[PDB]
Amino acid sequence: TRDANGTWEMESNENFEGWMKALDIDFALRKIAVRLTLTLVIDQDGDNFKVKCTSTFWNYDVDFTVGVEFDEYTKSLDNRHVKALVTWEGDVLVSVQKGEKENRGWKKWIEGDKLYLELTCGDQVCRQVFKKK
Numbered sequence: 746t747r748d749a750n751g752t753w754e755m756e757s758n759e760n761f762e763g764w765m766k767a768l769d770i771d772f773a774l775r776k777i778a779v780r781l782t783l784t785l786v787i788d789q790d791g792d793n794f795k796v797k798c799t800s801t802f803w804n805y806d807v808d809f810t811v812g813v814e815f816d817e818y819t820k821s822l823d824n825r826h827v828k829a830l831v832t833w834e835g836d837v838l839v840s841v842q843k844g845e846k847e848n849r850g851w852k853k854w855i856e857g858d859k860l861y862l863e864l865t866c867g868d869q870v871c872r873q874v875f876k877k878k
């Protein structure tokens with residue numbers, strides 16, 4: 746339940762639009778984002794993670810070390826400066842992004858070959874499920 750390595754293909758994605766709207770993403774761009782196939786590629790070695798989300802028009806790449814706060818600029822998303830921190834809460838991988846938005850971050854539950862991802866911003870939660878390819 747703690748190994749997130751691999752290429753992860755989307756199976757479900759609920760309230761993607763509400764989460765993007767909470768981040769203030771342009772309405773026009775949200776309507777395209779909702780159509781795009783998203784692939785999550787994770788390289789995990791000890792505390793070190795390299796995460797890459799890919800689609801036809803936008804990528805989102807982040808590298809981090811568990812337990813080490815990092816300055817982050819969401820240049821390809823909402824373009825904000827946040828102080829990010831990723832930690833283990835049991836077998837749940839938890840990101841908090843401190844900044845303008847409240848309740849901002851994500852949580853990842855790895856259950857064998859399924860990855861459950863909950864992205865939060867403000868009062869919005871988007872729930873995604875991926876399957877390991």
Ligand SMILES: *C/C=C/c1ccc2c(c1)C(C)(C)c1cc(N(CC)CC)ccc1-2
Pocket residue numbers: 765778783784785796798799800803804805822851853862864873
């Ligand atoms: C463990 C997963 C964390 C994480 C961080 C950022 C993003 C994601 C996952 C994705 C794959 C859900 C994602 C998608 C997008 N785009 C839509 C607006 C497509 C590139 C941005 C950021 C993240």
